[PDB]
Amino acid sequence: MIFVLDVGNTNAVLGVFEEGELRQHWRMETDRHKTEDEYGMLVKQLLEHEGLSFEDVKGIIVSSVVPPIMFALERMCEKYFKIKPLVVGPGIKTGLNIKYENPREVGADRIVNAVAGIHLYGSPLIIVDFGTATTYCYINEEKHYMGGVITPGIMISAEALYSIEITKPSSVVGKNTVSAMQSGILYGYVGQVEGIVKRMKEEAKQEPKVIATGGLAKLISEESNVIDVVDPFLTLKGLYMLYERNA
Amino acid sequence: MIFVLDVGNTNAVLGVFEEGELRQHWRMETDRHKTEDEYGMLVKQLLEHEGLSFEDVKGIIVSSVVPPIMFALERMCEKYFKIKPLVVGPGIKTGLNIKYENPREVGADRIVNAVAGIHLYGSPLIIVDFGTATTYCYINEEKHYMGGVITPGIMISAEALYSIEITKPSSVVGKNTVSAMQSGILYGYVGQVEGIVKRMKEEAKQEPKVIATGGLAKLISEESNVIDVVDPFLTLKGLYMLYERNA
């Protein structure tokens, strides 16, 4: 089985693929305090409750935006799995044609998401990833990664305000402060996504399918039709594709 | 003449009204370091270059969200103008019917803006104020302040990202990082405003005129039709109305 790890500033998502299918996934807060042995012990527990052992895992790929924890995760992989993981970084092969002027500044997971999205959903595509930032990538009808749009993420924008559950209020016009802020975050974000996506489609030669991922993709897609498919595991699936290409 | 002062966390706007009309306005960064005498000396200079003296000013009203500078501004008014200013606060009379459940938690300038907007533009109204936060207030067809919507302000959201000039990029799909972020802030914000305003109008009995104010109102209104009137001096005009009612 192949173990994938997508580590964010705030959250990590783990998954195990068996015969090219996602067997199980797990989500957690990124912990800069945790040691290689405490990662190994937590992973042991996740595997055990899934009916798996370390031995079941034959390959590992990690994508991370947190250098201060890479050393420990790599050491945990080497110690518990006896495997040196593949790290998504400069010089990993992806098969992705990047026409963006800044290919090296493209987030690793935008690349991963584009590889998965094109393989799973075709082209042209708009990919919306609601994470720490909300990104919108545009892949053209020749499967070229053209670039896109970056905005503040739902939680980071909600924190800068409330300074948290993204709840639907009983009305848009908030009859009270909490209600006004709930409306603002939710409907403001929906309006943001609708507006950007409509403008990106306007610039497009062929009309693209819109796919979204990230924890809060579902909330947004419940409120709008602008998103065609929510795929919560796009990045995991992409990292699995990358592992296979690079094995 | 009547001197008005609207002091924000980040910016202050001053104005002088002569025969009920705004004669001149001045904008500046709020300075927590400045003393009462350095405020008096700066005001002296602004008046001189306008052809005015301290003596010309017979009344003063101040609205402020920065308590640490009120003492100095009040002392400057008392010393240079020989006037104790009216302060927008609990117990100032406004003539505004507030149906919002949290009347006391309504920003002073939302009240000021509503008083000015209703007097100058009628009802029902949607008032959009692009400041530190972007607020959307809804006044119903009986001129009642119903509440509204609060979102992160253009600059605070742009800072949390870039961490600045809000520029129109050459395309929505940014061909490069800076371009992607420019698109995101600008078109994301436009989409946010369009979406919220359309939802607020949907809840409205009569169809409201939409008025906007704040430094960046013009940028947004250039990009959308959702705003009927940009009135850059709504708050100044409101504070003038409040001074007159309370004199």
Curated annotation (Swiss-Prot), chains A, B:
CDD domains: ASKHA_NBD_PanK-III
GO molecular function, one term: metal ion binding
Active site: D109 (proton acceptor)
Keywords: ATP-binding, Coenzyme A biosynthesis, Cytoplasm, Kinase, Metal-binding, Nucleotide-binding, Potassium, Transferase
Recorded coiled-coil stretches: none
Any one GO biological process: coenzyme A biosynthetic process
Family in the record: Belongs to the type III pantothenate kinase family.
Function: Catalyzes the phosphorylation of pantothenate (Pan), the first step in CoA biosynthesis.
Protein name: Type III pantothenate kinase
Organism: Bacillus cereus (strain ATCC 10987 / NRS 248)
